[PDB]
Amino acid sequence: STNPPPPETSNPNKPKRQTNQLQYLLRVVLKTLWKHQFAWPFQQPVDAVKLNLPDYYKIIKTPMDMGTIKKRLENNYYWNAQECIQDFNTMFTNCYIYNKPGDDIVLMAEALEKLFLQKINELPTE
Amino acid sequence: WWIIPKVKKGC
């Protein structure tokens, strides 16, 4: 009936590094997706209270959104690029699981996922 | 913005 707290985005006990793949994920992948016409429902955690989705978090136990991913990248929360990629994949899969295939949100997620894959296919070598 | 949340957007 309430929203859960949003995912953690900062942790001073985790080691921190910057890598060229993590920089690409932030400056190319995240930035490109954020600017997309269909990004707005994905820029913050799903507000199941405001959107009147009382079962959202009864079904989705691993919420993820691009606002969280951005702040995780900015806080050097991720050590491996694959951690970040997994969060993007979780965000898309949540949307496909909760919603129905003809819903506008799913059409939006599919277009963003296509763009995501196009950018991930160009991920630079480490 | 949503006409029906998730189902139909209005923008």
Residue numbers in the entry:
A (entry chain A): 42 to 167
B (entry chain C): 1 to 11
Sentences copied from the publication:
Within this class of proteins, the bromodomain and extraterminal domain (BET) family contains four members that are transcriptional coregulators and that recognize acetyllysines (AcKs) using a tandem pair of highly homologous bromodomains (BDs). Despite heavy academic and industry investment in this area, the generation of paralog-selective inhibitors has proved elusive because of the extremely high sequence similarity between the bromodomains of family members (90 to 95% within the acetyllysine-binding pocket residues). Crystal structures of 13 distinct peptide–bromodomain complexes revealed highly diverse structures and binding modes among the cyclic peptide ligands.
All of the residues in all three structures that contact 3.1C are completely conserved, consistent with the very similar affinities observed by SPR. The peptides that did not display a preference for the BET BDs, such as 3.1C, 3.2B, and 4.2A, tended to belong to families with members in all three selections.
